[PDB]
Structure 1
Amino acid sequence: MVKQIESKTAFQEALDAAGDKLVVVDFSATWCGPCKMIKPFFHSLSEKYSNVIFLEVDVDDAQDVASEAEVKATPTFQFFKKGQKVGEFSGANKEKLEATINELV
């Protein structure tokens, strides 16, 4: 499934709602072009891996989460679980999301 975080409020409730399932957050500029160009991959696993929780944060609408997350280099993918950061990596490597997702799966 997918869940757009509009504010820090939905951020915490989203991690607790996930439970123990994986939680990969994608920090990108939906308004940007070359950045939103990597959505047919990350946001695409929603139909391939229905057992994964994907969060889409807009560094422009939820600038509150971008500031607290200290995201200064988009796109940036972070791996959270039970509400704990257990991995993260910045780079336009769509193929890495696979090897990484299969890591804490």
Structure 2
Amino acid sequence: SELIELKQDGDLESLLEQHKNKLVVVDFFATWCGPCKTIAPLFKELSEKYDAIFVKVDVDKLEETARKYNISAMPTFIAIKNGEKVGDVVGASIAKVEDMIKKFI
């Protein structure tokens, strides 16, 4: 499994260049968000089930990245394939997140 928690704007772009052959799935979350805390260990369980790169982004730490992907509602999950955003799930729905991964992996 690979599960990477980012620190500052620019970190996702580096990650994407360094993981070119693989689907990247990003959980945009906030420290004030309860459903984000509930879904966190389940997103970690998915990272152990699928051969993709799982990434966590705190929207208060990566504010320009949150803007780049038009992120509003917490959590939002996006799938990034060959460097482009291809799908999203808005809200804490682990079934939806898994369905999105199956569609793009």
TM-score over 0.5 for the pair: yes
How far is the alpha carbon of 1:99 from its aligned partner? 1.6
Give the aligned partner of residue 74 of structure 1: 74
What's the % identity of the aligned pairs? 43
What TM-score do the two structures reach when normalised by structure 2?
A: 0.87
Aligned partners of 1:67 and 1:98: how far apart in 2? 24
Give the aligned partner of residue 52 of structure 2: 52
What TM-score do the two structures reach when normalised by structure 1?
A: 0.87
Unmatched 5+ stretches in structure 1: none
Give the aligned partner of residue 14 of structure 1: 15
- Residues 15 and 81, structure 1, Cα contact 8 Å, conserved in 2: no
- Residues 77 and 90, structure 2, Cα contact 8 Å, conserved in 1: yes
Moved more, 23-32 or 79-88: 23-32
How far is the alpha carbon of 1:25 from its aligned partner? 0.7
What residue identity is the alignment partner of 1:35? C
RMSD of Structure 2 on Structure 1 (CA): 1.5
Matched positions, count: 104
Which structure shows the higher helix fraction?
A: 2
